[PDB]
Every structure is written in C-alpha cells, then in structure tokens.
Amino acid sequence: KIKVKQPVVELDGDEMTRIIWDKIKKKLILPYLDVDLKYYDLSVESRDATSDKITQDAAEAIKKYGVGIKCATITPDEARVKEFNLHKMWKSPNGTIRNILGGTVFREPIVIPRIPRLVPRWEKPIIIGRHAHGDQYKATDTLIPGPGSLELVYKPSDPTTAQPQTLKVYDYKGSGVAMAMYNTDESIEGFAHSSFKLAIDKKLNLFLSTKNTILKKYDGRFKDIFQEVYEAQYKSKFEQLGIHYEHRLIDDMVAQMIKSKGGFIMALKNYDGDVQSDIVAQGFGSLGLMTSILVTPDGKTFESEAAHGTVTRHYRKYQKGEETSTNSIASIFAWSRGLLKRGELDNTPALCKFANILESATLNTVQQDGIMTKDLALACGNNERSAYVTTEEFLDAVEKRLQKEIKS
Amino acid sequence: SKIKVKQPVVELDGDEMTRIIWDKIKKKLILPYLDVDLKYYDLSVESRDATSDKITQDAAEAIKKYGVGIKCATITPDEARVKEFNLHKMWKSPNGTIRNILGGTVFREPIVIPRIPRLVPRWEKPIIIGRHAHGDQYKATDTLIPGPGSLELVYKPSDPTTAQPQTLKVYDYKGSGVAMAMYNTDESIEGFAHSSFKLAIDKKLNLFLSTKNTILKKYDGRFKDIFQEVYEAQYKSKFEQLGIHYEHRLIDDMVAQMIKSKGGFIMALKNYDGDVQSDIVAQGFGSLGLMTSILVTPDGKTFESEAAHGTVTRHYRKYQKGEETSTNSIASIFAWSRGLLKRGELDNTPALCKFANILESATLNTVQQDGIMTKDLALACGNNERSAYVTTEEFLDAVEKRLQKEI
C-alpha cells in the first residue's frame, strides 16, 4: 500500500454520482492507498440538515490541508425543494467553495482517441482557465416594481484616502430588473498568475477574453492587470519558450476557437469560463469527458471536482433496482488529478505514478478493450444494446485493468 | 427599368474596407436598378467625432421615422483608435446606441453556401439566434474601486405608495477592484418574447430561451417568467398546431446541446449571449462573414439590417498603398437586400422584394456555381494558391454580371 503523506479532503455528493463515487473509492483507491480521508458529506440531505454549513466546513478543510476531491452535487431548485422538504433553495455548493478558496478553475477535456470529435479540427486540447471568484456568481439582483431611480453607491471606509461615488444607473418608467456585481484586483491578479504559470508549465499560448470595448472599466481592469502581471514576472519566460500572450474580445476568441485546431489556453471570466467550458467539452466529444480543478495563486491549494452533473433519471432506475449505464470517468479523473496534486506537494512519486496508470487503465478500458457506458457507445454511433455495459460492469473492468497495469 | 421604391430608406455609412465595398455595392448593385431616396448618415469615426457622436443619434431617429435602416460596419473606438484618429472621446459603440434607441431583437443566422465546408459538420440546418437588443452589459454602469468601503444598489420609487425603496448591500471591499450595475425593463423583455415566438411560428422552428436563472434568480428569472407567460397567453396553441415547442434552457445545457445538434432551431438569447453565440454559430457554419443581422421592433414597423462582421483594417491598409485586395462583400450585399426586402414588404412593392431575392440569388450563385470568390472563402474551401480567388472588385463585377442576367 502506498502511503499518502498528508490527509486528503473528500467531498461526497448526490444520487448516482454518489453511488459511483463510493465504488471508485472502495475499489480503485482504498485497496491501493493508505490515505487519511477527511470526509465532508455535501449531499442535499446533509447540506439541508447543517443549513449548508457542511459546505463551508468542507471548503475551510481544503484550505487547511491543501487538496480537496469533490463529487457532483445537486443545486436544489423549486421542484426539488418542494419534494425533499428543504428549508430553502440553497446556493450552489461549487459557488460557495469557489468563493472561499478563490483562484482559477482549469478545465480541459479527457481525450479518448476512439470518440468522435464534434469539431473535427480540434486535435490538440483546449484548456479553459475559468476565474473562480465573483461577477454573476456573487451578484446582487432584484425586481424593480415600478418607476423610480437606480443608483450605484460606494462609500469608502476612509473618506480621506478615497472618494464617495453615487453613479446614476437607470431611471425606470415601468417595472423591470436590476443587478450589480463586483470583483477585486487581488482575485483578478491571482487569476492572471495561474493563467501565466500554466501556459509556461504546459508550453501553450494564452488568450484572455473580455468585452473591454463595452465594459471599459470592469473589463479593462481584467485586461490591464493581466498585462501588468505579464510584464511583472512573465515576459522573459514567454519569449524564451516561444509562446505568446494576447488579449482578445470574446467575439474574436470564441470564433477563432471554433475555427482552430486547438492547442492553447483560454483564460476566461467566471461566467464565460462556465458557458464555454461545456462548448469545448461537447466539441471534443462529450460533457462526461472533462476534468475540472480549482487552483489558488500561491500554488498550494487545490480542489479537483467531477464536472458532469448527476442525472436523476439514472438514480430512480437504480432505486427501483433497474440497471444503469452511467459513466464514471469524470468521477475517476476527479480522484486521480487530486491525488496527483497531493503527490507533487508531498513529493511522493509512488502516488503520482499510481494516479497516472489509474487514468491510463480507465482510458484503455474504453479505447483498447471497447468497454464503455451507454453515452460513449451512442457517441460512437453504436446503437446496439450489446455495445455498452452497465454502471457496475464498467467499474469492475477498470478495476481489473488497474490490477493488470500495476503488475506489468 | 429602375423599380420605384415608395418610401425612403435610411442608410448608415461606415469605416475602412467595409465603407469602400459599401459604396461599390451601392453604385453597382443597388442604384442602377432602383429609384430610391436614401437618407444618408455617415457613421464613420471621423464623422462621429466631428459631430460629437450626434450623427449616430440622428441616424437612429431617422430609422424610427422612416422604418427601415441599412447600416455599414463601423469602428467602435478604443485607446489605439483614439491615438490614430485624434479622437476627442472614446465614443460608445454606435451599434449599442442605435439598438438602445430602437429596442427590440437582433436576428442572426448564417448565410449558407453548401460548397463551403462546415466547421461543425452536423450543422445541416440554419440555427437562428434571436439576440435581445436592449440593455444589460450594453447599457451598464461600471467603475473602479480604489479601496475599502461599501457598495450598494439603491432604488427610490417615484410613487412611494405602490413601491418600497430598496437599499441592497452588494459588497464590502477590503481592497481595490471593480463594480458594475446593469438593468432591463419588462416592456423590453415582452418585446423580446413576442418577436421570438412570432419568428418561431413564421419559420416553423423550435424555440429555446437560454438563461442563468439558477444564479440570477430575479434578473434572469424575469426573462423565463415573461417568456412563459407570453407563450401561454397567445402562442401555446399555435405552437402545438404547428408541431413546434418552446422551452427554457440553462445557458450551459443549450450551448452544449447546440454544438451537439444537427441545427434547425431558434435560440432566444440575452444581449451578451446573443453577441457571443452568434459568432460561434456563424463560424461553425463556415465563415464569420457569411451571416445576416437584422434588428426588428415588436410592433413590426421598424427594422435595422446591418453588416456585423467588423471592418478588419488589414485589407483597408492594402487599399491605401494601391495594392490588390480580396475582401468578402456577401455580408454587406445581404444587409442591403434584407433591408430592401423589409422596405418592399412595408410599401407593398413586390418588384422590390423580387429584385432583392435575385440579388441574393446572384451573389450566392457566383460563389456556389461559378466558383468566383474572395480570399477568405477560398481558404475555407482549402486552396492556398493565388488563382483560387479573385479580387474585391472582380467578385463584385462577377455578381453584377450575374445580376444583369437573372433580371
């Protein structure tokens, strides 16, 4: 058994992804690793009970130990709130964790050669650096009942060092909606730093995307700080490596991305990184083939998460005792990438090496042995029922592939 | 000879290379065949500067006065542009100003030339984006925060009897940063709704509203709620009879699904999303240039047909030196034809609608059948050599030649 030097923070999730999660742990991880798992249950029932405090505790534990691994959770809506006697419509646990940790959520596709790419030219991986902090995800929005004035008001704590601002937003002549959001220079700076370090580390071109021609101050800040940071510590390293940094308007970027062959990093603001993430994932093959990892600017805190959401459809079938074919690759990779970041901080090559053949064994099950879940089988245009295996059958096959590739 | 257009048309001139092809189109493909009174508004950078951007204001009002506006691509100035042009102020995007004054929805769909390869192979049917043309980030107030302090969204109602004042805490800064507020009205969302549903019925297509209502529960919730209310009130029945469906989606689901789809549906989108996604769609179908963009109003009496692909100076700079140029004009031609189509529909002038359809037909056949195309479409087809494409003037000459035949 490989000794993990430091404990790992484990965040458990909901429904089908939770059922899959437990088997990954007990079969693909625990048998091979002596690891101290700090368990935090982020299920809807656990969150509702603790009044969502568990999410905060879990986030703070990741801050303490350095590495967190998270299972897919459900963000409750009106429908689920009514069915599962929920106190309120609890905020996204991912949003809460991201806000506490801050930084950048790096998302890139899990490339399986056999899978058809919906955007054929995309040969090389596209990495998305989604700023994890604020904007829409920490926004204040409200209904405007009728005619009136809307104002943005800033009051400095120290009126001697800074000035007050009362900016005219809008004069309503009827009912409508109003929202305000924010971000800090500290957070945008960390976002930049991580974007530049990954570009250097992975030898790729970096593109920041905003809309600074429309939002001159809010987006211009993203552009200015990035260029500031680039000139501060990264100019030489970029020139020596032969890679380029460039700011573009979100129009050019997304368009040039569709037209490209891939092979570059797109640093995106919280919202854009969220939307484009799925475009990229889907373009490369499927939503279920994408890693997602939160990194802090200091390079010591990590949160590896299962990107794909859990479908209730598969869960009910499972509760009825019917068979399921839910992919577990995203969940498996959540573990492996988390275990990698753990091994690099602790300086444990055995752990690093283990996580690599774990990934290798999972991908080879699909690529080499043709054993896969329904979604991939269909993506390959394999309409036969005998084309795919069950949820359980897939995981068992990966277990045996793990055993095989460990000994060879 | 020369079809008589009853009502005058408002024309907005633009910048750089697009301005040059604009004039070449007008003089060769438009003026020789129509008796049009063109209300001319120069929306170039130098023109807007000199008038302190009031010419953009004038043009928007003219469009509302007459009904149909045809606009050329313009420069939205930035730091570099201010330096190169000696601008007095970094003028707001004219498009934003125009759309704010007129309101409504901008409809965008690819101009499909089957010979041109699709970057998203499965896209066999046009995807139409219905972009909300009103507020949000295109009428927002943003600012810089120098240090620690509070940030509040303050609302004071005009009638303190029907509404309560709102003072909401947005943030307490512990450092320097950025703040911004944006808005939208129910009246504008209702117009967005009506335009979207009407189109879906007109074209017999499924309609999907995308939103981030899981995060912006009140703001984005209002979009979903109004659309749904409008659907049930006067469109649900019609949709069911046609075998089409309206559905509200999360922006995450929709784009992923769109990329996965075979196409052939309308995508109602908020201002920002419409801007971003329409360029993705245009690109996926083959070329960013091959795209129509027309703003409509809920009442059905005002239109703004536009060229939305920008100007891209790299060709204009070659025009300055007297060098050769191969810029695509299909988009700018379609801006005219679509405008005149709306003009013809309004005036009940069948001969104009007929001329506009032939103009489109000729323009497209020049590429599809005869193989005459500009540098950009040639590279899309996958041919690097020079003899693969023609010059800017050559393409327009070819279109004109084919225009004269099909008449």
UniProtKB/Swiss-Prot annotation, chain A:
Which Enzyme Commission number(s) are on file for it? 1.1.1.42
CC cofactor: Mg(2+); Mn(2+)
Q: Which domain of life is it from?
A: Eukaryota
List the residues marked with site Critical for catalysis.
Answer: 137, 211
Cofactor: how and how many bound? Binds 1 Mg(2+) or Mn(2+) ion per subunit.
**Per UniProt, where does Mn(2+) bind?**
251, 274
PROSITE patterns reported in the protein's UniProt record: IDH_IMDH (PS00470)
Entry GO CC: mitochondrial nucleoid; mitochondrion
Q: How does it assemble?
A: Homodimer.
Function in brief: Mitochondrial IDP1 may regulate flux through the tricarboxylic acid cycle and respiration. Its probably critical function is the production of NADPH.
The identity of this protein, by name, is Isocitrate dehydrogenase [NADP], mitochondrial
Name the source organism.
Saccharomyces cerevisiae (strain ATCC 204508 / S288c)
Higher taxonomy: Eukaryota, Fungi, Dikarya, Ascomycota, Saccharomycotina
Swiss-Prot record, chain B:
Parts of the chain that traverse the membrane: none
The protein's Enzyme Commission number: 1.1.1.42
Role noted for this protein: Mitochondrial IDP1 may regulate flux through the tricarboxylic acid cycle and respiration. Its probably critical function is the production of NADPH.
Give me the comment on cofactor binding.
Binds 1 Mg(2+) or Mn(2+) ion per subunit.
Keyword Protein transport included in the entry's annotation: no
Query: Which residues of this UniProt protein bind Mn(2+)?
Result: 252, 275
EC class (word) = oxidoreductase
Q: Which reaction does it catalyse?
A: D-threo-isocitrate + NADP(+) = 2-oxoglutarate + CO2 + NADPH
Lineage from the top down?
Eukaryota, Fungi, Dikarya, Ascomycota, Saccharomycotina
Q: What is this protein called?
A: Isocitrate dehydrogenase [NADP], mitochondrial
Which GO cellular component terms are attached? mitochondrial nucleoid; mitochondrion
Q: What does the similarity note say? A: Belongs to the isocitrate and isopropylmalate dehydrogenases family.
Kindly state the subunit structure of this protein.
Homodimer.
Q: Which cofactor does it need?
A: Mg(2+); Mn(2+)
- Inhibition and activation profile: The enzyme is subject to end product inhibition by NADPH and 2-oxoglutarate.
Entry binding sites for NADP(+): 74-76, 81, 260, 310-315, 328
- Specify the inducers: By growth with glucose as a carbon source.
